[PDB]
Design a protein around this ligand. Structure first.
Ligand SMILES: O=C(O)[C@H]1CNC[C@@H](O)[C@@H]1O
Ligand SMILES: O=C(O)[C@H]1CNC[C@@H](O)[C@@H]1O
Lengths: 596, 589
C-alpha cells in the first residue's frame, strides 16, 4: 500500500485532529459536480452528520433511497505547528467509493466502502489557515467491486441500488474522519507473530518505515514496564513469564516502535497487542494450544438512525449483551467493521472472524435481481469476474494489513455465500486465499461462509479453508414450521455426508436463525414467533452436538438489522436474538444458558 | 462567572482537542475514592463511552440504577506548543455535580448537570506530555439543587434516586469534552442585541476580555464579506440592507471580535449570529415586528442506549421530523440542551424557549415521592437556581434561535413565598440577558388563575394542561373540554393582555394500539384529544402558541404509570410518526 493503515495516535511526533461533526452535503443526481466546480465548495448543501449513514435522516423516499454520486464538504483549521509534517486526511471509510479533494485539488480515490482511505494532502495543505475538504462519493452496486449488486435506472432516470446481499445499502461517511500529521520519516506498518515457549513467549516482528534510519522496538507490560527490547526492522522480542491474551480474559502489552538517528528520536508508534497463538489441529481450533469452542454471533454495523454510523455507545452496549450471553466470538458479517470494534474486542478478550465484503456473489440472486424487470438472457461474467477478483484481493490486502495485529482477530473470512461448485470458482478463490496468506504475517486460519448450494458433493472450494463455516437454515428457509422434523432429518443427512468425507477439519456454523417478531407469541409456536425461535435453536443445537467436528456456533444475527424493503423483510431482518435497540427476545436466554 | 461560556473554536490564537472516546469509569458505592487516591487514577475501572449517559449500557439493575458517587478518567497528550496558553478542560456538562482533577490536583467543582464546566488547568498542565483528568461525579437528587428530588437508601446501603420529575435520572458525561488553549489575554464574553431600522439594522454589542488592550469588532455576511466594523468593547455595528434571521428562513452573519496590540492581534473570537428582534406586544409574540404563532414541541435529550448522550445524528433526524410537521419552535424541556442543538436551530430558523432545570418544585409530587418553598433549604435552592440561570443565559444569549427563557416547569406558585422566590429568579435573569428577551415559565394546573401569584412576573404565560388525559379522560372527554374552557374563560376574564402559549398537552399513546371507538392509550385517542385541544386553543384570541408534549417517547423512572417511559410522544423514541403526527403536520401547514 502507498499509505499506512496504522490507527492514528497523538504524541510528540504525530498529531491528529477530528473532523467529525456536521458536514455540508449535496446529492448530485445529474452528475454535474466536477464540471461545475463542486470540488471548490458545494453550491446548495444541507447539513450531514459525520460519522453516520445518510439515509435514515430524511423524511422522503427519494433522499433515503438515493443512489449515485453525492458530495460532502467541511473546513478545518490546520495548526501552524504542523508545517514540517506529512499531513494526511484519514477517513475510517468512504462508502462505497470516492475521490478526495483538498483545497480544490484532487488527492486520491478509493474503491471499497469499509476500510480506511488515506489522502496525502502535504502538498496542498495550508498550515495556520482554514483548509477545505470535499469528497465525491458514489454508492452504486456492480459486479466488479464489493459488495456486489446492480443499479437499476427507473423510468425517470432515477437510480436505485439493487443489492445481491441481505442488508440495506447504507452509505456516506460512516466512520470518523481525522486530519493527521506524521514525521517525514515514519513507521508505516509493522507485523507481530507469536510463539509460546513454556512460561515464556517470543514476539517476532517486522517494521516498515518510510526511511533508512535505525529502528528500536520495545515491549511494555500492562503497567508500562519494559519487558523486552531489541533493534532492527526485523527481530524477536523475548518475553519471560509472558501473560498470555486469553479468551474472555485479555492481557495487552504495548509495542513501542522508535525510529532514531542516534542523536534523537524521529518517530514513535505505539499500539496495544496481545500474546496469543491460533492454529487448527485436526478438528480443533487451538487458542494458546488449548481447544476453544466458538460461541457467539454474526453482527452488523447497524443501529437506529445512525445506520452503520460508528458510535462507542453501540460498542459498549453490544459487548455488555455479548458478555451477558456468555459469548466469546463474533464474525464481522459482512465487511470489516470500524477499527474501534477490534480495539474493544482486544480489551474484552473476544475472538473475531474478520470478514472481507465478498458477499453477493451467488448466481441465483444475481439472476433474480435481473429478472425482476427485466432480463433473463444477458449476463457477462467472463468479463467482470477478473475485475471483481482484483477488487476482492485489494480489499483483502487492506483488511489484513489494517487488522493483523489485533489479538482478537483469529481468522479471516474471505467470502459469504458465493458460488463454489465450479473449477472456475476454485481458481478464483485460490488467488484470494494465496493473497491473504501473503499479506498475513501470522498466516492465521482462513475460511469463508458457505451457503447450502455448496453441497458436499459439489463444492470445489472448501479444501482451501483451514476450517469450514456453514450458513444453514434447516427449519427456516428449508422445511420450516410444521416441517421442522423433516428439517432436522435433512440437516442430519447433510452433516452425515460431511462426516463421511472425514475431512479432519473443524466446522463452525456461522449462521442459523429464524425471523422473529418481538412480542409475537403462539402456543403451539409458529414461524416468526418468539417460541419458534427457541424451538428452532434447540433443534439446531441437537444437530450440532451430534458431530465431533463441529467446534463453533455463531447465530444469525446478534440483532435485528436494516435490509432493503420487500415482501420478505418486515422492517429489515428480524433474525436478531436481540432487537435493534439491543434488548433480548426469549431466545437470548437460551443462548445464555447453553453457553454458560 | 470566573470562566468563559464561549463555545470553543480553533484558529491562530485558540486551540482545541477532543477528549471524547472510551474513558475509564468506576462506581464508588462506599464513597472512598477521594480517601483512596482515585484522583490519581481509578483502581479497577471499566470502559465508558463519552459522550453518553452510563445507565443503559449495563445488563444488571444495580449498575443501571446506580445512584451516588462515580468516577471517570482519561489521559491525553498535550501538544508542546500549548505552553504558556491558558489551558482549560471544557466539559459540555457533568451530570449532576462533580469535581474535576487534573494530574492529581483538584481544579474545580460544579453543581448543575446541564451546562458547561470549565476547569483551568494552566498551572498543572504538562505540555508535550501525557496528562490525566479524573472526575468525581454524583447523581443524587435533593431539594437544594436542580432538578429536584430525593435519594432513598435501601436497607443494604444502596442509594436510589427518587425524582420529583417525570424523566429518568440519566447521568455521567453526557456531552463532549475538550481540552482547549486560549491566549493569556482573551475574549471571555460578548453580548449582542438588535434594532431594526427600516431596511437597515443595528447590532449593539458589549465585549468582556481578560485584559486592557483595544478591541475591534467586525461583522461578516454569510459569504464572509465585511459589512460593518467598529472599535471598542462597547459599540454599535451598522448594517445596511440587513438580511434578517427569519422563522424557518435563517440568515447568519459572523461576528468577529479581535483584541489588538497595535501592530498585531492577540485573540480572535468568531461566532455566527442572526439579526432578529423578539418582543411581546399585547397578546402577540412579535418576531421582527410581525406576529408569530408558535408551533412545535417540548423535547428531551433522549435516545435509545445513549440516553441523553449528544449526537449530531439525533439533531439531524429530529430537525427533519420537526420540519416535516411544519413546526417552528421547541422548548428545551426541562434543562438546557447541548449547545449544538441551538447552533442547529440557528441554521434552520427554529425558535427556542430555553429552559433552566427548575423542575420538581412541587409539593404534591414532592410529598408523595418523599409547602415546597417554605422549607429551610429554599434559600440554598434559590442560589442554585439563580446560578444555573446565569450560566444558561450567559451561554445561550447570542443564539438568534433563543427567543425566550423558561425559568421553571411546574413549581408551586400559589403562595407569597413562591412569588418572593421567583421574583429573585426573574430579577437575576433580567440582569444577565443583554437583550431582555421574554421570560416565562410553564405552569401546572395547580396554579389556578385565582391562586397563582407568579404569572405577573412573566412576559407571556405558558400553560401545561392535560384536560382529556389526567383530568376527565376517555369517556369523560366532553367534560374535559368544558373544564378546559371554564379555566380559559377565567384567564380571559382577567384581561391580562398577554399571550398564552400551551407548552404541554398530550396523551400516552402506544404505537400500534388501535381501537374503534378509541380508548385512552390508543393512536386514535391521541388524535381525538389533540383535535379537542385545538378547538379550545382556537377559541381564545390570546392563545399564540402550542407546543405538544412530547416530540418523542422518552425514558422515565419505572413505575405503574409508565410503560417503558413516557409515551406522549408524537413520534416514537426511534423517531417515527404515530397517527397524530399527521394531524399536527396538516394543522401547522
Ligand atoms: O437470509 C438471511 O437472514 C441471511 C442469509 N445469509 C446471509 C445473510 O446476510 C442473510 O441476512
Ligand atoms: O405527565 C407528563 O407526561 C408530563 C407532565 N408535565 C411535566 C412533564 O415533564 C411530564 O412528562
Amino acid at each position: 500500500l502507498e499509505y499506512s493503515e496504522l490507527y492514528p495516535i497523538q504524541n510528540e511526533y504525530r498529531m491528529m485532529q477530528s473532523l467529525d461533526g456536521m458536514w455540508k452535503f449535496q446529492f448530485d443526481p445529474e452528475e454535474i459536480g466536477k464540471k461545475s466546480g463542486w470540488e471548490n465548495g458545494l453550491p446548495a448543501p444541507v447539513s450531514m452528520p459525520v460519522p453516520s449513514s445518510f439515509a435514515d435522516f430524511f423524511t422522503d423516499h427519494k433522499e433515503r433511497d438515493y443512489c449515485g454520486d453525492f458530495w460532502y464538504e467541511t473546513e478545518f483549521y490546520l495548526p501552524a505547528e504542523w508545517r514540517n509534517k506529512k499531513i494526511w486526511l484519514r477517513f475510517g471509510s468512504i462508502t462505497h467509493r470516492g475521490t478526495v479533494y483538498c483545497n480544490g485539488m484532487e488527492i486520491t480515490s478509493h474503491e471499497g466502502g469499509f476500510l480506511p482511505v488515506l489522502a496525502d494532502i502535504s502538498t496542498v495543505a495550508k498550515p495556520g489557515q482554514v483548509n477545505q475538504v470535499v469528497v465525491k462519493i458514489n454508492n452504486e452496486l456492480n459486479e466488479t467491486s464489493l459488495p456486489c449488486g446492480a443499479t437499476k435506472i427507473l423510468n425517470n432516470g432515477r437510480k436505485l441500488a439493487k443489492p445481491y446481499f441481505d442488508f440495506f445499502n447504507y452509505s456516506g461517511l460512516q466512520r470518523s474522519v481525522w486530519v493527521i500529521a506524521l514525521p517525514e520519516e515514519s513507521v508505516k506498518d509493522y507485523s507481530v507473530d507469536y510463539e509460546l515457549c513454556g512460561t515464556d513467549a517470543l514476539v517476532k516482528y517486522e517494521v516498515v518505515t518510510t526511511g533508512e534510519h535505525p529502528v528500536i522496538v520495545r515491549l511494555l507490560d500492562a503497567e508500562g514496564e519494559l519487558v523486552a527490547e531489541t533493534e532492527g526492522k526485523e527481530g524477536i522480542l523475548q518475553v519471560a513469564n509472558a501473560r498470555l491474551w486469553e479468551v474472555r480474559n485479555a492481557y495487552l502489552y504495548q509495542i513501542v516502535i522508535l525510529i532514531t538517528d542516534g542523536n534523537g528520536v524521529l518517530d514513535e508508534y505505539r499500539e496495544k497487542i496481545g500474546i496469543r497463538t491460533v492454529r487448527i489441529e485436526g478438528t480443533k481450533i487451538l487458542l494458546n494450544d488449548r481447544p476453544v469452542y466458538l460461541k457467539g454471533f454474526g453482527k452488523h454495523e447497524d443501529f437506529p438512525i445512525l445506520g452503520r454510523g460508528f458510535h462507542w455507545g453501540i460498542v459498549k452496549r453490544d459487548f455488555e449483551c455479548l458478555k451477558w450471553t456468555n459469548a466469546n466470538c463474533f464474525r464481522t458479517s459482512h465487511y470489516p467493521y470500524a477499527e474501534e470494534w477490534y480495539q474493544f474486542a482486544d480489551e474484552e478478550g473476544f475472538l473475531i472472524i474478520d470478514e472481507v465484503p465478498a458477499v453477493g456473489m451467488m448466481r441465483s440472486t444475481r439472476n433474480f435481481v435481473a429478472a425482476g424487470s427485466g432480463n433473463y438472457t444477458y449476463f457477462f461474467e467472463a468479463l467482470t469476474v477478473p475485475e471483481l477478483l482484483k477488487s476482492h484481493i485489494a480489499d483483502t490486502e487492506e483488511m489484513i494489513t489494517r487488522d493483523k495485529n489485533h489479538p482478537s482477530v483469529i481468522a479471516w473470512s474471505l467470502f459469504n455465500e458465493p458460488e463454489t461448485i465450479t473449477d472456475y470458482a476454485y481458481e478464483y478463490f485460490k488467488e484470494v486465499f494465496a493473497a491473504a496468506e501473503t499479506y498475513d504475517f501470522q498466516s492465521r486460519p482462513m475460511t469463508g461462509a458457505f451457503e447450502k448450494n455448496s453441497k458436499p458433493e459439489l463444492c470445489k472450494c472448501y479444501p482451501l479453508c483451514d476450517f469450514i463455516c456453514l450458513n444453514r437454515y434447516y427449519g427456516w428457509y428449508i422445511s420450516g414450521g410444521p416441517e421442522i422434523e423433516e428439517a432436522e432429518e435433512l440437516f442430519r443427512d447433510e452433516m452425515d455426508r460431511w462426516k463421511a468425507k472425514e475431512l479432519n477439519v473443524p466446522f463452525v456454523f456461522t449462521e442459523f436463525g429464524t425471523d422473529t417478531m418481538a412480542g409475537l407469541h403462539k402456543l403451539p409456536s409458529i414461524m416468526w414467533s418468539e417460541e419458534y425461535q427457541k424451538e428452532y435453536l434447540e433443534m439446531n443445537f441437537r444437530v450440532f452436538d451430534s458431530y465431533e467436528f463441529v467446534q463453533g456456533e455463531l447465530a444469525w444475527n446478534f440483532a435485528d438489522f436494516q435490509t432493503t424493503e420487500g415482501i420478505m423483510r418486515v422492517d429489515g431482518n428480524h433474525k436478531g436474538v436481540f432487537t435493534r435497540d439491543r434488548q433480548p427476545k426469549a431466545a437470548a436466554v437460551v443462548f445464555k444458558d447453553r453457553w454458560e
